[PDB]
Design a protein around this ligand. Sequence first.
Ligand code: HEM
Ligand SMILES: Brc1ccc(-c2csc3nccn23)cc1
Length: 370
Amino acid sequence: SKEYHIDEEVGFALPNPQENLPDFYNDWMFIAKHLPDLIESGQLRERVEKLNMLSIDHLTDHKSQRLARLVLGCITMAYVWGKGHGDVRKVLPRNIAVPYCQLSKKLELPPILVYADCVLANWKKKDPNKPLTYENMDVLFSFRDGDCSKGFFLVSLLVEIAAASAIKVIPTVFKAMQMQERDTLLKALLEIASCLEKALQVFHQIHDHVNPKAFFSVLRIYLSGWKGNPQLSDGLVYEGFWEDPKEFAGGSAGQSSVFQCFDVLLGIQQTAGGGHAAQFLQDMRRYMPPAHRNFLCSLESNPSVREFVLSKGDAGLREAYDACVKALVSLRSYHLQIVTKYILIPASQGGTDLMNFLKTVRSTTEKSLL
Ligand code: HEM
Ligand SMILES: Brc1ccc(-c2csc3nccn23)cc1
């Protein structure tokens, strides 16, 4: 893969994310570096209205314009949601809303916190010579002390890295179908399933680094957005850029490319059917980095791996393709049980609509067996 922005060690994650902005943007990072306290003390919101509108002409490289997208997104959620107790701002100050919107249209992303910001670009290594383990990693920004933002953002990022071992096989899968090497394709399909069989064990780390009550009551509030939300029934006013209020969806892992790139690979038509679940995942491709959004396009253009395995009558190929699909069904089933412990049960002490979305997705993945 070339120019699709896919590292081979971390995958869709941003490799070596930049931690510090230039000196010119010291007013921004100081606000973002100290979000837990500026929110509790009620100082944040005024300190955004007391900002001087800066210019993005001094963010040059890729890793700057991404971290600035991470900084102005963490700030925007804190301004809009405040302490996370219902008090909602409907207007975003123009001295920060303009450079955010200026930077978004440069990266073809929407002006809101997305999966690619606080998961894929929000990380670093403690010791830069030790492996990618939860113990050697940390996040760049949090929202509130005790929000379990580290365990949430990082366990998701570690799954994104276990999937990288399977994405470097994708070119060898398509080559083996054009040059027609059945034995090479079977090796590839079995290797992909093995990588997805190992990623399921990374999902277990969520139980030692995230709290149910602190995720439901606290963290889920700051990752929310303004789209069909009664708290901003019309949307958010981005002062300076649009005279109209705009609606953008909140933080969702439907913007994640890992589990989508395999549905596209294995021919699972998750994005067809005109349902609420099929609609949601296609819309969330606009919240994806344009290179990752284009890599998924190139996968949907290549010939189907399903319509190839099904056309040869090869009991060895069918059982390997089912190994890939059964690996996805297990991941999503474990993921479903996590939402039960972390959303449904806490809400019993809004969610049913969400757990139905995953069951629709898990079932479609499971109907694609052979
Ligand atoms: C406490 C932990 C977790 C909770 C409560 C949770 C919750 C949810 C919910 C409610 C949805 C559907 C609504 C939405 O998209 O916002 C979802 C979707 C999704 N989440 Fe999670 N999740 C957790 C952990 C993870 C992790 C660690 C990953 C790692 C990649 C992940 C990946 C995904 C994906 C790919 C989807 C899209 C559905 C699919 O493609 O199957 N989730 N999650
Ligand atoms: Br913004 C943002 C959007 C999504 C996530 C995320 C990682 S895993 C997971 N399940 C549901 C959401 N989600 C984290 C930050």
